[PDB]
Structure 1
Amino acid sequence: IGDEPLENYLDTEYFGTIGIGTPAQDFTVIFDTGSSNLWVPSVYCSSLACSDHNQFNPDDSSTFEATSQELSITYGTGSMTGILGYDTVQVGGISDTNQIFGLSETEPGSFLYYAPFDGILGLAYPSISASGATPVFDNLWDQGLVSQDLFSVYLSSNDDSGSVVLLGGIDSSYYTGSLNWVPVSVEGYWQITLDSITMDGETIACSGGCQAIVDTGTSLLTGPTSAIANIQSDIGASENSDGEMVISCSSIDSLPDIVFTINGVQYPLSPSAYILQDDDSCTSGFEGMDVPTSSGELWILGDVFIRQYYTVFDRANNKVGLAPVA
């Protein structure tokens, strides 16, 4: 079981440290369950986002193996094109040997240039892995490096220390009562079926269910624009400049829980979970984002939700396990 400590930056991005190579070059990465690929900046990248960011030099690793397999990936925020090579990756105190990972050649856009992390470590299923590159957890299970075929995430609140990715195990100290398991409906993302979303008993969205992914890599709780636009009204948040659906911080103590019913069990987010507040200003935890898939237009249950529910991702049986954090 590996323990990968995570830095909670503004409750928006949780990232940890990995080493790639021999000797090991260090990089901080986002641990993303919305994707399956590991990749970091390389000395071959010309994009501006690579200049101010730690870059992987293959000519300094006695263990590196090159391949000619090119790679291309687009996220909701940012993309990269690169090439796939091979090496040891130290992640969560484990020596992942012979891991295929992406070395970037371009990271188009201004977004990532600003970001306090170098790369992305995907944790979704191999089916969505661009260029078929073996996911890290997959390569660990395959090598017998993790004791169990599950990892779990605890994401801290209020910029506190202690967020963790526990690879190969759960730790009951992080949750209250017991885990509820939900089947993955469609296996690629950790896609689970959302039964409904209510406030004060009335369905306000997702009537007759909708598809949801549990994404550690999304900050907010994102959903199909039109739906979210309602919720925003149902809590009185309004637009400021570029996505700032601003809400008065006085409102927090008046609003009601918004309940997510997944597999018959209700998972409420209180107003103090779904309103993010910096110092003296509040914002909405909900973001509109149409993400069309073959299995429907997704509802992404980001850090805003994961912050309240210790999440376990069982690959052995394709189930998500949720329980309230301690």
Structure 2
Amino acid sequence: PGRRGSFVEMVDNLRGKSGQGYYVEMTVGSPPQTLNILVDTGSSNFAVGAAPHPFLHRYYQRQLSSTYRDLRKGVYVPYTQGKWEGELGTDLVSIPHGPNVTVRANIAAITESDKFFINGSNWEGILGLAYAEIARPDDSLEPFFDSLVKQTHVPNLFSLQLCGAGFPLNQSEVLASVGGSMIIGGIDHSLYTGSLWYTPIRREWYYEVIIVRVEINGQDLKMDCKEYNYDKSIVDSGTTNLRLPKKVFEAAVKSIKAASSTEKFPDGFWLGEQLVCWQAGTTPWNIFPVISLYLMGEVTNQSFRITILPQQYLRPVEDVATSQDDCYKFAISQSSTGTVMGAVIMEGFYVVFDRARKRIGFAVSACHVHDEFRTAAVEGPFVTLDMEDCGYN
């Protein structure tokens, strides 16, 4: 059958890009104050700029909201990239291109920050979509999505289609372009092709999953599967890269270098610091390998795999000389806090965060970037044994 799209009001409600984040429009307070908010499945606090900042064009003004409630408590959140400090309160919140509901939610009003806001990102806050376990100050601060589900009839699920352009976008182009969809309360069948395959959420804190095998162009990386999930593996729209545990990163880059060895790239490229450029239209996608991550299935002893292309893990960037060349940075990097399946990997797929059934679904995205010879893929099943042993304790 033809796939129908039943969530038209929410399709195309995101803007942004992998490097600076994808955001959704929200309103806070009464009368409504419109703010653009970063969608972050890797944290659990809803927070907004609430004081002037050189990178903010607007911010939440609590004194102008008749529905604001002061919780008289400070909050601090330290992320990988940056950090902020603020003041807790609650207020009425809505998503204009979302469900037609208004809920009272916890809001951290950011008063101080460091390396948090991004110049020209066009967002002024963050929506942490993960679970209360990782909320600051503690798990008693109910996250936004929990409030939404408790106060309304919205089903306990959301899905994300992050759309990478495959070329650079300046601030103006981001403003005028659609960056994807966040479907709150459902799955929109127009956003993917093929089947949805589900992996269990191991524990409800981050959106933690278990990787059981890694291949580079079909070649098994052949590491003990616990290495892939040391000390966790998470699905995170708030991180740009695919980040891998140090040892896995070292093995994967050695394999990616070997597969792409018809061209030599500088160390700075592989360290994700330096861009590489090709003459317009000549990027040699075919010399770079595909990367497959096998994920634990819902059926005992079954796994499935998701496969990405270099069009996902090579992130388009503007040249230092703004020429006609096509330039990119390598968007796979090392981590000391486990695997992070960031935005550049989520760009290949429509990802379903099925909280009700404690599982994450993946399907090939209808907006993934590819070429005439290869596409991203989601395939299965594979008979995989002792998959629970892949989890790190």
TM over 0.5: yes
Q: Which amino acid aligns with 1:33?
A: T
Once the two structures are superposed, residues 262-313 of structure 1 have per-residue CA deviations (whole angstroms, 9 ceiling, x without a partner) of 122121112222212335222212022211xxxxxx1010111111110011
Query: Secondary structure, in 3 states, of the residue corresponding to 2:306?
Result: strand
> Root-mean-square deviation (CA), in Å?
2.4
Gaps of 5+ in 1: 292-297
Once the two structures are superposed, residues 136-178 of structure 1 have per-residue CA deviations (whole angstroms, 9 ceiling, x without a partner) of 11111101241x1100001112166250111100011111122
Displacement of 1:14 in angstroms is 1.1
Displacement of 1:113 in angstroms is 5.0
Q: Which amino acid aligns with 1:266?
A: R
Q: Distance in 2 between matches of 1:274 and 1:204?
A: 17
Greater alpha carbon shift after TM alignment, 91-100 vs 66-75: 91-100
Q: Of 286, 304, 307, which residue of structure 1 is paired with 2:332?
A: 286
Q: Which amino acid aligns with 1:303?
A: A
Q: Which residue of 1 aligns with 2:373?
A: none
Q: Of 181, 184, 190, which residue of structure 2 is paired with 1:164?
A: 181
Once the two structures are superposed, residues 48-91 of structure 1 have per-residue CA deviations (whole angstroms, 9 ceiling, x without a partner) of 55x73422211101111111122111111111111111111112
Displacement of 1:245 in angstroms is 4.6
Query: Secondary structure, in 3 states, of the residue corresponding to 1:272?
Result: helix
Q: Distance in 2 between matches of 1:231 and 1:290?
A: 15
Q: Of 201, 204, 227, which residue of structure 2 is paired with 1:184?
A: 201
Q: Of 245, 261, 268, which residue of structure 2 is paired with 1:224?
A: 245
Find the structure with the greater CA-based Rg. 2
Sort the Cα spacing of 1:53 and 1:77 in 2 relative to 1 into closer, same or farther, 3 A: farther
Q: Which residue of 2 aligns with 1:152?
A: 159
1:1-326 paired onto structure 2 within 5 Å: 3=10, 5-9=13-17, 12-43=20-51, 48=53, 52-91=56-95, 92-109=98-115, 112-114=117-119, 115-131=121-137, 132-146=140-154, 148-158=155-165, 161=178, 163-204=180-221, 207-209=224-226, 210-211=228-229, 212-236=233-257, 237-240=265-268, 243-247=272-276, 249=278, 250-263=283-296, 264-278=303-317, 279-291=325-337, 298-326=338-366
Query: Secondary structure, in 3 states, of the residue corresponding to 1:3?
Result: coil
In the alignment of these two chains, the number of paired residues is: 314
Gaps of 5+ in 2: 1-6, 170-176, 258-264, 297-302, 318-324, 367-393
Q: Distance in 2 between matches of 1:231 and 1:238?
A: 16
Query: Secondary structure, in 3 states, of the residue corresponding to 2:178?
Result: coil
Displacement of 1:247 in angstroms is 4.6
Q: Distance in 1 between matches of 2:145 and 2:18?
A: 27
Sort the Cα spacing of 1:161 and 1:140 in 2 relative to 1 into closer, same or farther, 3 A: same
Greater alpha carbon shift after TM alignment, 79-88 vs 231-240: 231-240
Q: Which amino acid aligns with 2:273?
A: E
Greater alpha carbon shift after TM alignment, 229-238 vs 118-127: 229-238
Q: Which amino acid aligns with 1:223?
A: L
Q: Distance in 1 between matches of 2:213 and 2:184?
A: 31
Q: Percent identity?
A: 27
Q: Which has the higher strand share?
A: 1
Cα pair 2:17 2:164 within 8 Å, conserved: no
Displacement of 1:248 in angstroms is 5.7
Could you list the structure 1 runs, at least 4 aligned residues long, displaced by more than 6 angstroms after superposition: none
Scaled by the length of structure 1, the TM-score of the pair is 0.88
Sort the Cα spacing of 1:52 and 1:316 in 2 relative to 1 into closer, same or farther, 3 A: closer
Q: Distance in 2 between matches of 1:197 and 1:271?
A: 16
